[PDB]
Amino acid sequence: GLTPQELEAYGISDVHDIVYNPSYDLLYQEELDPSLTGYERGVLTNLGAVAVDTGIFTGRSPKDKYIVRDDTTRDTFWWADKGKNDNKPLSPETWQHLKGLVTRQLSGKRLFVVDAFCGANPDTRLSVRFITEVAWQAHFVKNMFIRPSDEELAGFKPDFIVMNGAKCTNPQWKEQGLNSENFVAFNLTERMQLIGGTWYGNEMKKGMFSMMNYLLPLKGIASMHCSANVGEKGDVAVFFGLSGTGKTTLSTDPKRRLIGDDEHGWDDDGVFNFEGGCYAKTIKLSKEAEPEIYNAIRRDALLENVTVREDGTIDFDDGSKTENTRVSYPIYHIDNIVKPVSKAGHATKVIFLTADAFGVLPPVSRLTADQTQYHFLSGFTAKLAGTERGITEPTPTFSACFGAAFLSLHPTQYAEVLVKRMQAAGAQAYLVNTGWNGTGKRISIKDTRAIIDAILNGSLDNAETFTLPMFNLAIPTELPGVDTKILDPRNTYASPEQWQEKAETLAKLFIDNFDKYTDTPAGAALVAAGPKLHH
Numbered sequence: 001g002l003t004p005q006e007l008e009a010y011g012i013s014d015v016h017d018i019v020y021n022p023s024y025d026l027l028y029q030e031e032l033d034p035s036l037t038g039y040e041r042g043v044l045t046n047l048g049a050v051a052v053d054t055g056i057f058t059g060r061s062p063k064d065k066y067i068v069r070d071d072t073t074r075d076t077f078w079w080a081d082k083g084k085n086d087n088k089p090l091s092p093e094t095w096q097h098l099k100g101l102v103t104r105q106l107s108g109k110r111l112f113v114v115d116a117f118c119g120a121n122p123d124t125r126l127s128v129r130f131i132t133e134v135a136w137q138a139h140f141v142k143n144m145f146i147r148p149s150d151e152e153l154a155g156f157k158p159d160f161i162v163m164n165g166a167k168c169t170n171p172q173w174k175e176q177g178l179n180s181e182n183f184v185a186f187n188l189t190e191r192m193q194l195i196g197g198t199w200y201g202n203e204m205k206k207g208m209f210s211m212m213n214y215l216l217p218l219k220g221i222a223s224m225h226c227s228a229n230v231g232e233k234g235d236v237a238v239f240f241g242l243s244g245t246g247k248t249t250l251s252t253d254p255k256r257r258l259i260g261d262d263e264h265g266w267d268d269d270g271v272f273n274f275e276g277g278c279y280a281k282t283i284k285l286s287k288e289a290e291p292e293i294y295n296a297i298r299r300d301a302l303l304e305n306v307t308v309r310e311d312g313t314i315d316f317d318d319g320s321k322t323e324n325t326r327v328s329y330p331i332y333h334i335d336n337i338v339k340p341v342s343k344a345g346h347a348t349k350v351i352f353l354t355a356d357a358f359g360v361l362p363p364v365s366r367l368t369a370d371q372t373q374y375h376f377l378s379g380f381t382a383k384l385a386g387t388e389r390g391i392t393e394p395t396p397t398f399s400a401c402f403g404a405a406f407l408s409l410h411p412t413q414y415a416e417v418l419v420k421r422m423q424a425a426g427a428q429a430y431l432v433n434t435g436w437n438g439t440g441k442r443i444s445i446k447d448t449r450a451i452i453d454a455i456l457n458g459s460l461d462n463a464e465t466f467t468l469p470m471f472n473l474a475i476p477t478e479l480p481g482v483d484t485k486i487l488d489p490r491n492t493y494a495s496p497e498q499w500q501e502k503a504e505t506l507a508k509l510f511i512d513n514f515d516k517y518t519d520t521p522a523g524a525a526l527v528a529a530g531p532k533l534h535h
Ligand SMILES: Nc1ncnc2c1ncn2[C@@H]1O[C@H](COP(=O)(O)OP(=O)(O)OP(=O)(O)O)[C@@H](O)[C@H]1O
Pocket: 241, 242, 243, 244, 245, 246, 247, 248, 249, 250, 261, 262, 279, 280, 281, 282, 283, 434, 435, 442, 443, 444, 445, 446, 448
């Protein structure tokens, strides 16, 4: 695929061993090499999958994310210093120092080079070349990106390079005004991502997602943090939501063909996956509740940060290394998928998932057109942050478009293209609370799946509704397979008064958050679709 001389063109010198397009069999034996030390080491589990520890980082490091500010990006990027976001500006000169750190780190090493695609469609996909010195990092990108055919490899021409220098750090970070010795940096003039300090594989996956989020909407294509699936009739659904809200869990549905679990575009022909694999959360994983995900954990899946007992069994309940235990697998580890290309027609059902730790929002509501835009821009979820200290400190997150950490353009640009696509398809939107109600427990997966079924088969559209105060959400009066009591969140408190107190707290949070969008005529008009609180 490439010679040591081609790598020298990238700045990487004296590479003696090049592993181009490593096979799954080679990656397995690389990860289990008994002479490996530290965080490169894998262990074989009784399910047949290799498990690794990703080091000090067990999630992304948004405080270390930087984008070079130059004549290509200055007037188009959504900059952190010009709404809150992580797109912090970096100079071209400082970029050159970070590039030197990474290229020197990879020089004189045995390198894995993985060529892959981001985007299922040839007309808009990125041809990405990933370079790493850690086998399980190469395995991660083999699982998560689209694996080219032999014919596509023969004429592969990268238009983005990702250089993973996890083992290096930046000793000049203080004088350079950066956050730490680690860095995840992007340059759209050179079309490159550099990683230093963090080994975490998802920096590469979400890094390329951020690049698609820059390029696609500028060409009229929606770029979405959502899962997607399709029914027997060809009816497509997309599921937006922040991390942990259910996109992967609920899209992996035995009644539907999976398109993808996390990153999709929506062009003139329909909805298409960016990825070649899925990246499931494994904390407290239940084979009974999530059988398809559980079954995908086998040879060629890559487990991250799980606890493996001495006998090789996995303690999926153990969050000691992190609550964000994960498994990646190529998408064909799921039985019922769209193939050979992960794409389908236009979505007619658009589901916003949220996990409301305030216990206010109903399990399901059908949204008006204006409420759809209001809630898309708000991008709400919440967490019980204080659990380890024995308290419910519901902590809100408002992350525009249900994925602000990955947005490269202003939120209104994603909203505009999404609305355009939804209006052309006649799509309807729904808000689903996969989180908490007055019981202080999350709604069960079984009940949420039944809610999703009722959305997808048209049942919910055919129901009578009542209106929830404050948020003015249309809720169905009944739904097949779900206890009617929980459809109204007020019923899970000893009295509507307990819900009302929490609803007022949450409404104020939404109203304060939305204020930043009211600087345009269209945004000010959307306030009427948000929660109403005047006392
Ligand atoms: N009612 C529910 N619906 C969906 N998931 C639930 C529910 N109750 C508990 N869970 C748990 O919530 C988590 C949902 O995580 P999931 O991996 O689907 O999130 P995600 O939206 O795909 O996030 P990410 O974008 O970070 O991958 C899982 O751990 C799942 O078992």
